[PDB]
């Protein structure tokens, strides 16, 4: 497991967001910190970014969840966030599902895209989702 120094530094970083010391980072405290950093996050975006690392879905970030978030944030570049952003900009319509039309459109910036769709649709639902995208990326 992590050594004493690492866990101490990460506990300090956790308490940097956890003002009340209850052990969980509520979305309000994260929003207050973000506002103090000069940014203005909406409630919807803040909630969407707080369930990214929330494994149990309780709505708050405990210490292990924050440790996972740090373990994926300490690196200079994380493949997960870049893959998600690429998938988001792929989906022009914003419905969460990219069909063959958008793929063919973005590939122009026939057989190859057909092979991509055929080998990317693991469930065979006729369309490409986020799980299929991350499966193909890795």
């Amino acid at each position: 497991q992590l050594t004493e120094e690492q866990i101490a530094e990460f506990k300090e970083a956790f308490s940097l967001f956890d003002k009340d010391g209850d052990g969980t980072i509520t979305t309000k405290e994260l929003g207050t910190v973000m506002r103090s950093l000069g940014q203005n996050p909406t409630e919807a975006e803040l909630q969407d970014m707080i369930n990214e690392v929330d494994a149990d879905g309780n709505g708050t970030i405990d210490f292990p969840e924050f440790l996972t978030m740090m373990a994926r944030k300490m690196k200079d570049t994380d493949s997960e966030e870049e893959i998600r952003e690429a998938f988001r900009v792929f989906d022009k319509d914003g419905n969460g599902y990219i069909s063959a039309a958008e793929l063919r459109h973005v590939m122009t910036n026939d057989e190859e895209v057909d092979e991509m769709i055929r080998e990317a649709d693991i469930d065979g639902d006729g369309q490409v989702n986020y799980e299929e995208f991350v499966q193909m990326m890795t």
Partner: protein
């Protein structure tokens, strides 16, 4: 209404007298330059041509002094009309008398007709060998004749549109502003800074070069710094603070002019820096257009970089499923590079969005 008519009739007389004083001062300076240039080689200081030219300078100086006196009389009458006085002694303070005497003294220095000489001794540069000469006294009176250029500033101030305009004066007095020559200088430097900085420095380049040549032609038997294109080289490399050294002044006058040139060059580098810094800034209408164009560019780049990320990821997956390793590793490297590029363009787009939001 009995004061406005008089005030305008005195504004017009004051402006006309300033114009005529500038005309006669510049005529005196020009004839001084002509006579100084000619009396070196064309004829001698005992000739009748020199007597005629110096008589012309003196007759221009007498009329200039008369015009200065009449201008100050008109300004005294303006003080009377403004502050509702009745006795002219009331307008005559100590500062006003001092400035009248200063202008008269400045405008009464000119080459007096007749030949007079004084012994001039200077230490030659780079050899320190003394050189003596019997120089005329008209050269220590010709150089001060360039002090009549304050009439230029007076004419610029008096002829300015907002100094005499009724509406401009009303708006200025409504905001409690003094329309002195510093306000005119600031407005010129904010409207046309390059033109002012290019006229005021290339017109003083000729004056400094001529002064150096005139002062040093007495102690220069080589025609090195007493040649006009040589003095104009010395002054230019002094103003730009290069200071080569091959042409360094011999006499105290040349050294003083070079010191003044260096001081004004060190004061004009600041003006150049300010003007350039104010001329690189993009205006709001230009900055908005630039930001919109860069937003479009970054969106296109982001689209194509996401396309490249997915293309490389699929190629790597296909090579892995095709029981191949080397090409799979090459395409994994390409996928990592594409992900890094996508992150870079995303960060640039976010920075642009933040800048646009802060501006708007």
């Amino acid at each position: 209404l009995g004061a406005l008519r008089r005030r305008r009739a005195l504004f017009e007389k004051r402006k006309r007298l300033s114009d005529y004083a500038l005309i006669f001062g510049m005529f005196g300076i020009v004839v001084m330059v002509i006579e100084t240039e000619l009396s070196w080689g064309a004829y001698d200081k005992a000739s009748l041509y020199s007597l005629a030219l110096k008589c012309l300078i003196s007759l221009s100086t007498i009329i200039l002094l008369g015009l200065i006196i009449v201008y100050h009389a008109r300004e005294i009458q303006l003080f009377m009309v403004d502050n509702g006085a009745d006795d002219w002694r009331i307008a005559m303070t100590y500062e006003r008398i001092f400035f009248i005497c200063l202008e008269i003294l400045v405008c009464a220095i000119h080459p007096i007709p007749g030949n007079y000489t004084f012994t001039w001794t200077a230490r030659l540069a780079f050899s320190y060998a003394p050189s003596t000469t019997t120089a005329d006294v008209d050269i220590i009176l010709s150089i001060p004749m360039f002090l009549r250029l304050y009439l230029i500033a007076r004419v610029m101030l008096l002829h300015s549109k907002l100094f005499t305009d009724a509406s401009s004066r009303s708006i200025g007095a409504l905001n409690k502003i003094n329309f002195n020559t510093r306000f005119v200088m600031k407005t010129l430097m904010t409207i046309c800074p390059g033109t002012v900085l290019l006229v005021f420095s290339i017109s003083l380049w000729i004056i400094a070069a001529w002064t150096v040549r005139a002062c040093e032609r007495y102690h220069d038997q080589q025609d090195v710094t007493s040649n006009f294109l040589g003095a104009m080289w010395l002054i230019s490399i002094t103003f730009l603070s290069i200071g080569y050294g091959d042409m360094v002044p011999n006499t105290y006058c040349g050294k003083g002019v070079c010191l003044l040139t260096g001081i004004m060059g060190a004061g004009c580098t600041a003006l150049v820096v300010a003007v350039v810094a104010r001329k690189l800034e993009l205006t709001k209408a230009e900055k908005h257009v630039h930001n919109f164009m860069m937003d479009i560019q970054y969106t296109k780049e982001m689209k194509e970089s996401a396309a490249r990320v997915l293309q490389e990821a699929w190629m790597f997956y296909k090579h892995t499923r095709r029981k191949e390793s080397h090409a799979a590793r090459r395409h994994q490297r390409k996928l990592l590079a594409a992900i890094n590029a996508f992150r870079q363009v995303r960060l640039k787009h976010r920075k642009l969005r933040e800048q646009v939001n802060s501006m708007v």
